[PDB]
Design a protein around this ligand. Structure first.
Ligand SMILES: CCNC(=O)c1c(-c2ccccc2)csc1NC(=O)CNCCc1c[nH]c2ccccc12
Length: 330
């Protein structure tokens, strides 16, 4: 089997991407944020504290003839940005772009934090990292991909995120028309539960490529590109007037600037992130100071190849017995 669904930026800055998902019988369609950096499929629901719902579409398990309460199961997750959510668990039928999993754990939110309440466009998250990160207790649950994998034509999914435009998530096949050149595959460590790999280096604009190992994660659920302070300083040094602002929480730059590209290495291959992908607009409405899309990972503890990086590429998440990642230009 295979599945294919369109993913759409939630706003004009590509702050996140939402993908429609069918849950239950009859189908309830929710727009979920496909997140290769976490492993819980959780949703706004009829159980969510009412003051914490502000425009989201909710899953109502009582209206699904295939929903079953998973007895005694709860979940609770906290992310590095400080956001969180928690609740109970149902199993139900979940479909993505034609690919169906029965008995998928659907984690129903009783509580969500302010960042989630404030994003009316995101009805929940669909985790695509490794199932070892799943938070359901006392019995850990599997991701959608883990559940679907054996049935797929090939045990893979691909992310093709658009810049200011829709893109595609495919499950079970590689669309050879969706990229240019070849796909370069690179080794993955699953030890931290992430799609963790090692970039071979970087360049800033038309500058010389610096060969250096940068370990980090391929994370569709993080907006920005978080890299070591040395690398980030080298990038922003090329933008006149750019500075790290403690008050704003990272590098900012004059909105009148033309940003250089940023290149990262995948083996001998090179993915080029155009400069405009790195512009995240005024820090506050009407400001002429703009927020940068490349920021320091110092204090995260890991580097994160988030949407800013991934949207410059066609990305293969290969869930073969030894997982790997593939990157192609497009
Ligand atoms: C800044 C978002 N990323 C993280 O927190 C994160 C971290 C992390 C750890 C410590 C400090 C900062 C970041 C490691 S892996 C990792 N990746 C994820 O956690 C992926 N899931 C993001 C879920 C998420 C958090 N806030 C949102 C708001 C809208 C849509 C999705 C979200």
């Amino acid at each position: 089997s295979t599945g294919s669904a369109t993913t759409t930026p939630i706003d004009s800055l590509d702050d996140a991407y939402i993908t429609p998902v069918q849950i239950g019988t009859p189908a309830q369609t929710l727009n979920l944020d496909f997140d290769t950096g976490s492993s819980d499929l959780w949703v706004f629901s009829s159980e969510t504290t009412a003051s914490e719902v502000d425009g989201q579409t909710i899953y109502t398990p009582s209206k699904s003839t295939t929903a079953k309460l998973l007895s005694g199961a709860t979940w609770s997750i906290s992310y590095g940005d400080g956001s969180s959510s928690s609740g109970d668990v149902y199993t139900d039928t979940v479909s993505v772009g034609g690919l169906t999993v029965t008995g998928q754990a659907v984690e129903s939110a009783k509580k969500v934090s302010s960042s989630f309440t404030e994003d009316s466009t995101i009805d929940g998250l669909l985790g695509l990292a490794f199932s070892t990160l799943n938070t359901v207790s006392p019995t850990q649950q599997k991701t959608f991909f883990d559940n679907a994998k054996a049935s797929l034509d090939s045990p893979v999914f691909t992310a093709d995120l658009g810049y200011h435009a829709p893109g595609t998530y495919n499950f079970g096949f590689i669309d050879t028309t969706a990229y240019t050149g070849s796909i370069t595959y690179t080794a993955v460590s699953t030890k931290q539960g992430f799609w963790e790999w090692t970039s071979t280096g970087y360049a800033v604009g038309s500058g010389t490529f610096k060969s250096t190992s940068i370990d980090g994660i391929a994370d569709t659920g993080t907006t920005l590109l978080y890299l070591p302070a040395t690398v980030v300083s080298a990038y922003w040094a090329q933008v006149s007037g750019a500075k790290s602002s403690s008050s704003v929480g990272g590098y900012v730059f004059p909105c009148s600037a033309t940003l250089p590209s940023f290149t990262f290495g995948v083996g001998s291959a090179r993915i080029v992130i155009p400069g405009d992908y790195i512009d995240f607009g005024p820090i506050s409405t009407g400001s002429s100071s703009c927020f940068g899309g490349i920021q320091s990972s110092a204090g995260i503890g890991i580097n994160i190849f988030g949407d800013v990086a991934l949207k410059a590429a066609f990305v293969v998440f290969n869930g073969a017995t030894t997982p790997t990642l593939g990157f192609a230009s497009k």
